[PDB]
Amino acid sequence: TVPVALVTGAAKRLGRSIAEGLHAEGYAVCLHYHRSAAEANALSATLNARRPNSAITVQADLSNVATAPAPVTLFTRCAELVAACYTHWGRCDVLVNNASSFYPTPLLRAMETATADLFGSNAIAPYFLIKAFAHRVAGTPAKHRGTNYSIINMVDAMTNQPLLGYTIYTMAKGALEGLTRSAALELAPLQIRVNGVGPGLSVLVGHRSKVPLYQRDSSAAEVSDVVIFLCSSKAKYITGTCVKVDGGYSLTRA
Amino acid sequence: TVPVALVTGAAKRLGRSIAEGLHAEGYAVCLHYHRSAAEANALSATLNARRPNSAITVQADLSNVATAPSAPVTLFTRCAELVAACYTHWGRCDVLVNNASSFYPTPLLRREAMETATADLFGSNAIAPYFLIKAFAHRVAGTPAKHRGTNYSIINMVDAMTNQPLLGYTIYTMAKGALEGLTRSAALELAPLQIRVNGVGPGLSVLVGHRSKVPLYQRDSSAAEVSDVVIFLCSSKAKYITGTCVKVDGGYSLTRA
Amino acid sequence: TVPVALVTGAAKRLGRSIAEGLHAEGYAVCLHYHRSAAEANALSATLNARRPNSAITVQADLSNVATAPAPVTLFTRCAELVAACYTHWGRCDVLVNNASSFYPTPLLRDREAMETATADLFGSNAIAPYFLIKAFAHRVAGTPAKHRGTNYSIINMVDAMTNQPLLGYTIYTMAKGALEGLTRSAALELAPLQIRVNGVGPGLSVLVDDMPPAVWEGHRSKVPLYQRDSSAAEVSDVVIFLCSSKAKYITGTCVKVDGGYSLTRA
Amino acid sequence: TVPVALVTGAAKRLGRSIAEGLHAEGYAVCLHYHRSAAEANALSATLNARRPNSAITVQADLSNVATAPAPVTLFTRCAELVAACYTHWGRCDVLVNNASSFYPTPLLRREAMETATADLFGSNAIAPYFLIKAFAHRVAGTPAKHRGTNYSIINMVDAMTNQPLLGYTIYTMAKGALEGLTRSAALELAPLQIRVNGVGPGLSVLVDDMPPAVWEGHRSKVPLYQRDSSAAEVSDVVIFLCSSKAKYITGTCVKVDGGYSLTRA
Ligand SMILES: NC(=O)C1=CN([C@@H]2O[C@H](COP(=O)(O)OP(=O)(O)OC[C@H]3O[C@@H](n4cnc5c(N)ncnc54)[C@H](OP(=O)(O)O)[C@@H]3O)[C@@H](O)[C@H]2O)C=CC1
Ligand SMILES: NC(=O)C1=CN([C@@H]2O[C@H](COP(=O)(O)OP(=O)(O)OC[C@H]3O[C@@H](n4cnc5c(N)ncnc54)[C@H](OP(=O)(O)O)[C@@H]3O)[C@@H](O)[C@H]2O)C=CC1
Ligand SMILES: NC(=O)C1=CN([C@@H]2O[C@H](COP(=O)(O)OP(=O)(O)OC[C@H]3O[C@@H](n4cnc5c(N)ncnc54)[C@H](OP(=O)(O)O)[C@@H]3O)[C@@H](O)[C@H]2O)C=CC1
Ligand SMILES: NC(=O)C1=CN([C@@H]2O[C@H](COP(=O)(O)OP(=O)(O)OC[C@H]3O[C@@H](n4cnc5c(N)ncnc54)[C@H](OP(=O)(O)O)[C@@H]3O)[C@@H](O)[C@H]2O)C=CC1
Ligand SMILES: O=C1C[C@H](c2ccc(O)c(O)c2)Oc2ccc(O)cc21
Ligand SMILES: O=C1C[C@H](c2ccc(O)c(O)c2)Oc2ccc(O)cc21
Ligand SMILES: O=C1C[C@H](c2ccc(O)c(O)c2)Oc2ccc(O)cc21
Ligand SMILES: O=C1C[C@H](c2ccc(O)c(O)c2)Oc2ccc(O)cc21
């Protein structure tokens, strides 16, 4: 029988690679997107042409704001993301919190949008998603649960060496790290594993020559393959961990 | 000549110990409070009686919500206003201690309650500290270099034990994680203005069971056992220290179940 | 043509499981052992049965002491372990530093004990891996570039729980700390040769039941995920993954395999 | 009556400043040295002039080798360093493991080999272990009514060893070991109220023997102050962790690095 993965920010780049890698392992994939509707749908078309009934796409803004229909809260929109898996395939085995906004929030020379957007997508939405994922599992009768529940948070290998001017983003990745550890401890009784993967420089649009390994940013596969392994039954003893995929970049000093 | 400290959640417990310790070094202290008006004002009375015009108190809800006034007033404005209060009253703000921290369960395993918890926990512990630091920094940057103080220090109160999370406290644990990130990012970016940014993480302090589990002394800390560390990190002897965290937990993070 | 793995302490438990997992991927394996000669030979028969000439065994004390021949240093014993791979199969692609001694060295209450403990605990957990990495790297550097393999990888078996020290095990915990510094230092310095160096740190894995059963049950019950120790495979599969081409951007890291044990507090 | 501090590598640089700082708080100081006899002796002269019988000097090689006789072990040499405090003043309250060897051991290219491992691992990790063990033994053997009331051990570790200096593998491993000792000793020695902490400099009193451009180069990399630290900028932190105000702190490391560890290449 066929497991289901929910992948946020799945339309392009690492999220796409993650969805493709999970698809190749036999997963049906729910492809979340925000603005990249055409890329999400083209992705879904490729994958459904490969195996019918193996991809859907769902839209949501994961910023921490109310949207239009009572206003719709982020919590609700997160619970509905997970509900789309259960509605279409009756299960949700893997969650990958990949979607992320990333832009400067300088301390030294509006703010309310940056805060909602950078914290929502990077931290608050992952928490609501993990909470909805777990409620669904706890509400499944023990005999009917899957046997390999796995949540991956995409964190950042370099946030201990902060990028100058990216405070809110760096704070939100730090919160997402605390989510990995607290969610791994609390959800262990349900056998839901929760882990982090931290890219260094991946698929850049010249820090890249500073990467000790190969002196380049990584490909998308070089990160997504790690995510796929941590979701595999071979990784069943791994929880509350964080795997850097950074080519040694976090080893460098100015 | 007299430096000024702003201490959030200053009315009781570690915040009061911190404001007392800074006061003892000669600081004037702005005592921020939320609901503890009576406790804050009693503290300010004591300090003012000891040294006239050495304490004020200022009220603010550091939850990430709008509050009642034109338009409603955002967290950002209330945070700027706290820093402004020190500049208004005393012409300076040398030290900021981000101590205010709302703490209660947010279980993942079983909502008006969760919008509230998110705003309150993610606010007091992480978002308000960010806007406070930004307002602190704006001020210094806007002060002519010749008139700047010589010892700017920001202290974030974090948690020695959040790498070993307390079961059921996810949002609070996330918010302390964000606050650790703020310490390292602000330390790097504010270094050109010589503004130092460090963390102090208590383990168990002034508990109101696990106390027996602390390797050193088998008890929680007193308030001064934490606040003395804060005061050291704000002293000129600590001027090469930035971007770092000091645990004050009597070895509790060393323990495994 | 067939890649080669050296696995120290490979006779039993996790080192055996590592050697088997690498053999299953198609590596030829040099199984190092110290006193478990019968177990190493047994395992070597099994692998050589699945696939002829794909396992050998080599004996070495990896304690930081000179042995009987002029006297033989630890360094020389480590260079010879790596040489054995090259002599027999013309290459060494993978090194797994797994061999480890582990016993109490209390700070609080014969100096023979104290002496030999330091040499044995540091040698096997830290100094031999240093020399082994040095020898592995000198060989790769000494290979004409055209003839180099395309996936060199060193795994160092660390401990997920050494930041929460086991009471009474100071020297062991210090040695594991040196071994984490070796991972980071060797990763940085060997990056130009495309040699990845990563850590795997098992928490409670194949716990020997050699005390009252309440103590074995009590230990296991503390692990958040499954309330048990791991199987050997649950660790060795991570080792295998990190040596595979799909891990080729991963270096200088440490993967904990601990069921969330390091998330706990007393 | 007067508390006693044992400082290793006390003769120059940070160890000298730690010794002076502790002395300035009223400590008697046992000044350990290996080659810098003239410096150690001058320091003891200064401290003894300031306060009679407040300093002594003791010489020991802290490399993990046996020395000139039956050979003397690094273990015995460390117990005797502790015993000198007890023989002269009857106590030892503070131990600062400051002595340190630091030089390349490249992975990529005879008695230079074996001597490097012994010297780098000895000074930075194994001698700190035997010193802590001796220090602990002496406290456990003291009747509780005669115990000091503020025992503190400080290990000098390195803020930057997680971003390893290229070519310095043995050194970086030795400091990793010493961080392990901080955490395991703090756990084990907590029942005797002996606190065990680390202080990690980044770039402190950077030595002058390179071209000025290269010296200014290194310094300019530190976010805070674009300079290396003074010796007192590190030693003040050491002294604060030894003070009774720090009595709830154990098993922790304090970085004194001007934010150098927050950088990336
Ligand atoms: N690539 C790199 O070098 C690094 C990546 N990372 C982390 O790895 C993960 C993936 O990286 P990468 O593939 O580069 O990610 P991208 O920066 O390409 O962003 C991923 C997706 O996030 C979605 N997203 C952004 N904001 C929101 C929002 N408010 N609501 C909903 N979705 C949103 C976007 O979806 P849409 O396009 O549909 O609008 C976007 O495609 C991220 O979590 C990132 O933080 C960390 C360090 C370095
Ligand atoms: N005590 C301990 O053992 C531990 C403490 N810590 C940290 O140390 C610091 C001090 O601890 P402790 O003294 O026990 O702190 P408290 O738990 O007593 O909290 C301090 C003050 O924070 C203020 N506060 C709470 N919510 C808000 C809000 N929404 N807006 C404004 N202010 C608010 C309250 O002010 P008022 O009373 O005026 O409403 C409260 O008095 C905190 O940052 C805490 O997280 C970390 C781990 C353990
Ligand atoms: N199992 C666990 O719970 C944990 C394991 N680890 C680490 O994982 C690795 C594997 O664990 P595990 O399988 O339990 O290991 P073991 O304790 O079973 O020991 C591994 C092997 O190391 C070899 N060894 C010991 N001392 C020496 C020496 N002086 N010279 C050469 N070889 C030596 C022994 O070989 P021989 O039998 O041939 O003498 C032994 O079989 C080790 O590095 C360990 O420290 C870390 C934390 C927990
Ligand atoms: N300065 C810096 O920027 C940094 C310093 N540190 C750490 O801080 C501490 C103090 O630093 P610093 O003042 O620079 O230290 P030094 O490099 O100046 O060394 C201090 C003393 O160690 C002694 N020593 C060296 N080898 C041996 C040995 N085999 N046995 C006995 N003693 C020995 C020497 O004593 P003698 O002269 O008497 O021979 C030397 O003066 C050290 O632990 C260092 O590792 C860490 C990172 C950066
Ligand atoms: O593509 C990037 C590079 C960008 C980056 C660029 C340069 C760096 O040195 C560095 O650490 C990170 O990091 C990201 C963080 C979030 C995200 O969604 C995308 C990226
Ligand atoms: O008083 C406490 C104890 C409480 C606590 C209690 C028990 C623990 O094991 C632990 O880690 C933490 O932590 C706090 C966190 C924030 C705060 O504002 C107050 C406290
Ligand atoms: O087999 C074990 C379990 C043992 C162990 C692991 C975790 C514990 O809490 C504990 O009490 C004991 O740790 C080891 C360390 C090194 C080693 O080579 C083997 C082991
Ligand atoms: O003097 C130094 C500076 C030196 C140093 C520190 C930071 C650097 O970037 C660098 O290149 C060199 O580190 C040391 C380590 C041990 C020691 O005993 C002394 C020193």
Numbering used by the authors:
A (entry chain D): 5 to 73, 81 to 120, 135 to 230, 240 to 288
B (entry chain C): 5 to 73, 80 to 120, 133 to 230, 240 to 288
C (entry chain B): 5 to 73, 81 to 120, 132 to 288
D (entry chain A): 5 to 73, 81 to 120, 133 to 288
Excerpt from the paper describing this PDB structure:
PTR1 is present in Leishmania spp. and Trypanosoma brucei parasites, but not in the human cells. It is able to reduce both unconjugated and conjugated pterins and provides a metabolic bypass to alleviate DHFR inhibition. PTR1 is a functional homotetramer with four catalytic sites. Each subunit has a single α/β structured domain with the typical topology of short-chain dehydrogenases/reductases (SDR) and is characterized by a seven-stranded parallel β-sheet sandwiched by three α-helices on each side, that represents the classical dinucleotide-binding motif known as the Rossmann fold.
Moreover, these experiments provided the first X-ray crystallographic structures of LmPTR1 in complex with chroman-4-one derivatives (compounds 1 and 3). In both compounds, the carbonyl group in position 4 is H-bonded to the NH2 group of Arg17. In the complex LmPTR1-3, the involvement of the m-hydroxyl group of the catechol ring in the interaction with the NH2 group of Arg287 is visible only in chains C and D, whereas in chains A and B, due to a flip of the catechol ring of about 120°, the p-hydroxyl group interacts with the side chain of Tyr283. All three flavanones show a percentage of inhibition of LmPTR1 greater than 50%, with compounds 2 and 3 being the most active (IC50 35 and 36 µM, respectively).
